[PDB]
Enzyme design. Sequence first.
Site, PDB file in Angstrom:
ATOM      1  N   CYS A 120       0.794  -1.206   0.000  1.00 45.30           N
ATOM      2  CA  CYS A 120       0.000   0.000   0.000  1.00 45.30           C
ATOM      3  C   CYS A 120       0.841   1.277   0.000  1.00 45.30           C
ATOM      4  O   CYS A 120       1.587   1.544   0.950  1.00 45.30           O
ATOM      5  CB  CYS A 120      -0.916  -0.006   1.216  1.00 45.30           C
ATOM      6  SG  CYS A 120      -2.184   1.243   1.045  1.00 45.30           S
ATOM      7  N   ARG A 123      -0.308   4.547   2.614  1.00 45.99           N
ATOM      8  CA  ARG A 123      -0.201   4.465   4.052  1.00 45.99           C
ATOM      9  C   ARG A 123       0.036   5.764   4.817  1.00 45.99           C
ATOM     10  O   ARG A 123      -0.025   5.760   6.048  1.00 45.99           O
ATOM     11  CB  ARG A 123       0.845   3.423   4.423  1.00 45.99           C
ATOM     12  CG  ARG A 123       0.357   1.985   4.239  1.00 45.99           C
ATOM     13  CD  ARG A 123       1.481   1.004   4.487  1.00 45.99           C
ATOM     14  NE  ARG A 123       2.411   0.895   3.366  1.00 45.99           N
ATOM     15  CZ  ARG A 123       3.620   0.360   3.472  1.00 45.99           C
ATOM     16  NH1 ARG A 123       4.025  -0.090   4.645  1.00 45.99           N
ATOM     17  NH2 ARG A 123       4.412   0.243   2.416  1.00 45.99           N
ATOM     18  N   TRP A 292      -9.469   5.321  -1.255  1.00 41.97           N
ATOM     19  CA  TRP A 292      -9.800   5.979  -2.513  1.00 41.97           C
ATOM     20  C   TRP A 292      -8.738   5.578  -3.527  1.00 41.97           C
ATOM     21  O   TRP A 292      -7.604   5.287  -3.173  1.00 41.97           O
ATOM     22  CB  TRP A 292      -9.892   7.507  -2.358  1.00 41.97           C
ATOM     23  CG  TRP A 292      -8.692   8.159  -1.772  1.00 41.97           C
ATOM     24  CD1 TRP A 292      -7.483   8.369  -2.375  1.00 41.97           C
ATOM     25  CD2 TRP A 292      -8.577   8.690  -0.440  1.00 41.97           C
ATOM     26  NE1 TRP A 292      -6.627   8.997  -1.500  1.00 41.97           N
ATOM     27  CE2 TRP A 292      -7.270   9.204  -0.311  1.00 41.97           C
ATOM     28  CE3 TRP A 292      -9.452   8.775   0.651  1.00 41.97           C
ATOM     29  CZ2 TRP A 292      -6.815   9.803   0.871  1.00 41.97           C
ATOM     30  CZ3 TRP A 292      -8.999   9.367   1.825  1.00 41.97           C
ATOM     31  CH2 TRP A 292      -7.688   9.874   1.925  1.00 41.97           C
ATOM     32  N   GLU A 297      -4.484   2.737 -10.989  1.00 44.53           N
ATOM     33  CA  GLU A 297      -5.203   1.504 -10.707  1.00 44.53           C
ATOM     34  C   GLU A 297      -6.307   1.306 -11.738  1.00 44.53           C
ATOM     35  O   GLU A 297      -6.555   0.188 -12.206  1.00 44.53           O
ATOM     36  CB  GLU A 297      -5.825   1.560  -9.312  1.00 44.53           C
ATOM     37  CG  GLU A 297      -4.881   1.225  -8.191  1.00 44.53           C
ATOM     38  CD  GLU A 297      -5.552   1.349  -6.844  1.00 44.53           C
ATOM     39  OE1 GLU A 297      -5.805   2.508  -6.431  1.00 44.53           O
ATOM     40  OE2 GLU A 297      -5.841   0.289  -6.220  1.00 44.53           O
TER      41      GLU A 297
HETATM   42  C1  HEM Z   1      -6.547   6.083   1.255  1.00 47.54           C
HETATM   43  C2  HEM Z   1      -6.166   5.697   0.010  1.00 47.54           C
HETATM   44  C3  HEM Z   1      -5.471   4.553  -0.317  1.00 47.54           C
HETATM   45  C4  HEM Z   1      -4.664   4.482  -1.399  1.00 47.54           C
HETATM   46  C5  HEM Z   1      -4.300   5.617  -2.363  1.00 47.54           C
HETATM   47  C6  HEM Z   1      -4.137   3.142  -1.467  1.00 47.54           C
HETATM   48  C7  HEM Z   1      -3.521   2.670  -2.611  1.00 47.54           C
HETATM   49  C8  HEM Z   1      -3.175   1.317  -2.816  1.00 47.54           C
HETATM   50  C9  HEM Z   1      -2.692   0.783  -4.077  1.00 47.54           C
HETATM   51  C10 HEM Z   1      -2.229   1.565  -5.328  1.00 47.54           C
HETATM   52  C11 HEM Z   1      -2.584  -0.578  -3.914  1.00 47.54           C
HETATM   53  C12 HEM Z   1      -1.945  -1.596  -4.884  1.00 47.54           C
HETATM   54  C13 HEM Z   1      -2.852  -1.676  -6.081  1.00 47.54           C
HETATM   55  C14 HEM Z   1      -2.635  -2.942  -6.879  1.00 47.54           C
HETATM   56  O1  HEM Z   1      -1.550  -3.093  -7.489  1.00 47.54           O
HETATM   57  O2  HEM Z   1      -3.568  -3.784  -6.890  1.00 47.54           O
HETATM   58  C15 HEM Z   1      -2.979  -0.860  -2.548  1.00 47.54           C
HETATM   59  C16 HEM Z   1      -2.834  -2.115  -1.961  1.00 47.54           C
HETATM   60  C17 HEM Z   1      -3.183  -2.389  -0.648  1.00 47.54           C
HETATM   61  N1  HEM Z   1      -3.757  -1.473   0.233  1.00 47.54           N
HETATM   62 FE1  HEM Z   1      -4.010   0.470  -0.023  1.00 47.54          FE
HETATM   63  N2  HEM Z   1      -4.581   2.355  -0.428  1.00 47.54           N
HETATM   64  C18 HEM Z   1      -5.434   3.202   0.297  1.00 47.54           C
HETATM   65  C19 HEM Z   1      -6.229   2.755   1.358  1.00 47.54           C
HETATM   66  C20 HEM Z   1      -6.221   1.438   1.883  1.00 47.54           C
HETATM   67  C21 HEM Z   1      -6.860   1.090   3.132  1.00 47.54           C
HETATM   68  C22 HEM Z   1      -7.802   1.982   3.938  1.00 47.54           C
HETATM   69  C23 HEM Z   1      -6.320  -0.118   3.534  1.00 47.54           C
HETATM   70  C24 HEM Z   1      -6.525  -0.888   4.701  1.00 47.54           C
HETATM   71  C25 HEM Z   1      -7.326  -0.637   5.783  1.00 47.54           C
HETATM   72  C26 HEM Z   1      -5.370  -0.505   2.509  1.00 47.54           C
HETATM   73  C27 HEM Z   1      -4.704  -1.755   2.484  1.00 47.54           C
HETATM   74  C28 HEM Z   1      -4.007  -2.238   1.378  1.00 47.54           C
HETATM   75  C29 HEM Z   1      -3.566  -3.618   1.181  1.00 47.54           C
HETATM   76  C30 HEM Z   1      -3.637  -4.771   2.174  1.00 47.54           C
HETATM   77  C31 HEM Z   1      -3.061  -3.683  -0.061  1.00 47.54           C
HETATM   78  C32 HEM Z   1      -2.473  -4.851  -0.828  1.00 47.54           C
HETATM   79  C33 HEM Z   1      -3.601  -5.788  -1.235  1.00 47.54           C
HETATM   80  C34 HEM Z   1      -3.146  -6.886  -2.176  1.00 47.54           C
HETATM   81  O3  HEM Z   1      -2.115  -7.535  -1.894  1.00 47.54           O
HETATM   82  O4  HEM Z   1      -3.832  -7.101  -3.197  1.00 47.54           O
HETATM   83  N3  HEM Z   1      -5.292   0.459   1.480  1.00 47.54           N
HETATM   84  N4  HEM Z   1      -3.350   0.295  -1.877  1.00 47.54           N
HETATM   85  N1  LIG Z   2      -6.911   2.522  -3.681  1.00 48.10           N
HETATM   86  C1  LIG Z   2      -7.039   1.318  -3.141  1.00 48.10           C
HETATM   87  N2  LIG Z   2      -7.379   1.208  -1.865  1.00 48.10           N
HETATM   88  N3  LIG Z   2      -6.834   0.236  -3.885  1.00 48.10           N
HETATM   89  C2  LIG Z   2      -6.957  -1.137  -3.405  1.00 48.10           C
HETATM   90  C3  LIG Z   2      -6.820  -2.119  -4.548  1.00 48.10           C
HETATM   91  C4  LIG Z   2      -7.783  -1.754  -5.664  1.00 48.10           C
HETATM   92  C5  LIG Z   2      -7.541  -2.506  -6.984  1.00 48.10           C
HETATM   93  N4  LIG Z   2      -6.162  -2.231  -7.502  1.00 48.10           N
HETATM   94  C6  LIG Z   2      -8.589  -2.079  -8.007  1.00 48.10           C
HETATM   95  O1  LIG Z   2      -8.174  -1.568  -9.074  1.00 48.10           O
HETATM   96  O2  LIG Z   2      -9.806  -2.254  -7.731  1.00 48.10           O
END
Ligand code: HEM
Ligand SMILES: NC(=[NH2+])NCCC[C@H](N)C(=O)O
Lengths: 416, 414
Positions: A120, A123, A292, A297
């Site tokens: 993520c 974070r 968001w 993505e």
């Molecule tokens: C607030 C905006 C947030 C943004 C911009 C963000 C963005 C991202 C992005 C770009 C990915 C990887 C996308 C991909 O390659 O599939 C991701 C993965 C992840 N995010 Fe975030 N995230 C956010 C919020 C969250 C929240 C609120 C949580 C947890 C409570 C979280 C937990 C994770 C986890 C566990 C992954 C990896 C999931 C996997 O292995 O498929 N994210 N996030």
């Molecule tokens: N901004 C995020 N929280 N992304 C979480 C994973 C979302 C996923 N990569 C999608 O395109 O649906």
Amino acid sequence: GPKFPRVKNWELGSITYDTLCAQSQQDGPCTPRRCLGSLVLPRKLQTRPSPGPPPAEQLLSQARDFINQYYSSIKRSGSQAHEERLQEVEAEVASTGTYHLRESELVFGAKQAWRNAPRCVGRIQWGKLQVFDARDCSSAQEMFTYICNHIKYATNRGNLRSAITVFPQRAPGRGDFRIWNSQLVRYAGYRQQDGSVRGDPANVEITELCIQHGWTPGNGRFDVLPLLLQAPDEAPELFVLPPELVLEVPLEHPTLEWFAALGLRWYALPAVSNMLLEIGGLEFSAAPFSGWYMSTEIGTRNLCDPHRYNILEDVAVCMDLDTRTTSSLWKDKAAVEINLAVLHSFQLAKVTIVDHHAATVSFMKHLDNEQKARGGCPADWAWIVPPISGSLTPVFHQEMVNYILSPAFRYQPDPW
Amino acid sequence: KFPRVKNWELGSITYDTLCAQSQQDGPCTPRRCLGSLVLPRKLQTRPSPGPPPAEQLLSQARDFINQYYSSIKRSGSQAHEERLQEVEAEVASTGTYHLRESELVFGAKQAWRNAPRCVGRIQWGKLQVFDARDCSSAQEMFTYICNHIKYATNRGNLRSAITVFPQRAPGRGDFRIWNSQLVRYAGYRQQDGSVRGDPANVEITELCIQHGWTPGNGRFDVLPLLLQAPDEAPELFVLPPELVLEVPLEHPTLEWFAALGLRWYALPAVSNMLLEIGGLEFSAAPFSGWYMSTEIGTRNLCDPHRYNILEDVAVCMDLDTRTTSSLWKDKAAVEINLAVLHSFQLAKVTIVDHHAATVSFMKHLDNEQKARGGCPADWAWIVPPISGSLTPVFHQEMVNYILSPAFRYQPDPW
Ligand code: HEM
Ligand SMILES: NC(=[NH2+])NCCC[C@H](N)C(=O)O
Ligand code: HEM
Ligand SMILES: NC(=[NH2+])NCCC[C@H](N)C(=O)O
Ligand SMILES: [Zn+2]
């Protein structure tokens, strides 16, 4: 020098030492012989359905670890409340095999889990997660209510808010609470006669599952899937999200007027819902979370991946580019415009989103913060660097150490 | 045991069994992955003032000798046995041994074949190998290097090549090419700490001046070489302008691009890496192939710590550099990479774009799967710096490990 990984940022030439990894108690997939860092699903964290109650000995130590983590975060490590809580956990595990978390403990862990997620890039917002406690939930119907409330609060009419809804933890012998869908909001993937797919190829299986469960399918390229919610020891029930709760954004380009005619669109809320949230040993099989989108993505992975919507060639033809030769960089050109369109369409519709530039810069700030607060920050390079314009972002030039810390989100086997 | 490798675009799967042949260790451990690190913390290449343990060297040697004969389909043959005895005998009596040209040639190609970070390995079999072990002076090295450059360049129709100087010897200084590449642009530090030219070459540019080089004041001043013969201060040699082919950069449609005065050399030739074959170490073994457009257009010209020309092009394209969301950066990078491809093609100089390159690498992965049961690859380096998911390699999982013969990083001689 220091006996910890030496990490360097080749852009700024600066150095740091990750001492935080020393706290990792869970092995990853690599070994000195070979690195398996690029694997998406390494058979490691894989929380296989473990029916027989967890070794009280293993669980207790994981529990004592989290409790220490909690009292530490509140600056009361070694205090009377800490030792008594520690006793309370062991006691409860002694006479029931498991234990329960206090409200504030759940909130803390949920945030740590996010804080600890290596993939993520968002974070920097980890401290603002809204944690909905749904550990009282007792039915698939009730699950639907919680999920709908989650979507309502999180969507917030376009001004998105991070949140997570925690349903009942796993109980020895009893069945798990589960959300069969990979995300609360996903588009249908209809297998065709010739063999092709209409909609999102990624969701072909779950679409065929909703059908085998009473869903009357549509035939569009952007049909919102119904939810398959499963309460303990029951077969999943089917719920259709009220259209008014599922906010979507039609995609249009700021200058290529014809782009809007493509009829492309995407939903505003990204809510992963098939991951397991593990805190102090306890396993929350159903705890959908959402934030968001970061524009790549949608614009790069979801819309341009070969195995997804794959709209790269259509947009290139529309831009009248030479799709008959690689050196014309027709793919790179169309990808840029598609990404720009997502950014444009979301801003125009006043729906929260962040571009890969702003996003990565914020993650660099997050890294500098965590370096001071915890001595490091676990990160998966391949997932942090954006799918387009990689070295144009500062994260590309930042070496990263990856390791597993708990609390944590882990992948888990599909219920079916 | 053997890792299951999946390609998420095709749903295809494979099992890497080649990684089992790895005898050298990486930086990763089960506790944490350090795969994104550029240089090794410890996996360096410590000095050779003393001879390496005969048993360790002898085993690395036997193994390589086994690899060679297996390559020419004559294992267990008479020659194979007699060669193994020659090696044994030489090691036991001198603490080291020497390779025969054909073995050297087989080694070099394998070193390239095992290079985890190289995306152009489909060409691994077509490598021209110059034996330069009959070298005893910096001046001789310079002639050797000038011939490599002539052959490699071939009037724009590039041909992969490597020149191998004398192997390292116990207690004796190493033959070394101080430059990181045979052709590099000087980096001059100016008043306000800024840099004129290539920032990555500030240090080497300075060492040259220190050794009597009359520095220029341009952004693309081809540097001189600092060649070093064992235990002798490095010598300075200037490359004949006619030997150093260069490509002036212009844009297919943006007439103003050329007005930027940007250019780049045709020959990518790493010269500071170490070549290890069967325990033997070659401290000076420059090698070259041909560029992949993104090396120039994305990294060299757009990296923040390099020529960092992203904003200039952006302004000329009159892009909204006020906000990141306008993607002015992505838009400029694309045209800069386009100009590189346009120019090199216009000047009839070999080059490969990142799409063609990765497609060819996928083919290589397949050829290697069937040929050896796997292919060591470093994902972060194989996937291009721009449009990553737009290429096939992005979607291919990869296993990374160290195989020998191999190219390794070694300490800077100063
Ligand atoms: C607030 C905006 C947030 C943004 C911009 C963000 C963005 C991202 C992005 C770009 C990915 C990887 C996308 C991909 O390659 O599939 C991701 C993965 C992840 N995010 Fe975030 N995230 C956010 C919020 C969250 C929240 C609120 C949580 C947890 C409570 C979280 C937990 C994770 C986890 C566990 C992954 C990896 C999931 C996997 O292995 O498929 N994210 N996030
Ligand atoms: N901004 C995020 N929280 N992304 C979480 C994973 C979302 C996923 N990569 C999608 O395109 O649906
Ligand atoms: C024929 C055309 C070739 C192409 C297009 C090609 C392309 C590449 C690319 C893109 C990289 C990554 C560069 C970077 O990001 O720094 C690379 C790395 C590498 N290539 Fe090749 N390569 C070619 C020929 C060769 C040859 C002939 C050799 C050796 C005999 C070779 C050895 C290597 C090595 C050792 C690396 C890693 C260098 C390092 O660790 O910094 N390549 N190559
Ligand atoms: N194609 C190659 N063999 N490249 C070797 C490394 C060259 C380096 N990436 C450069 O931009 O100069
Ligand atoms: Zn690793």
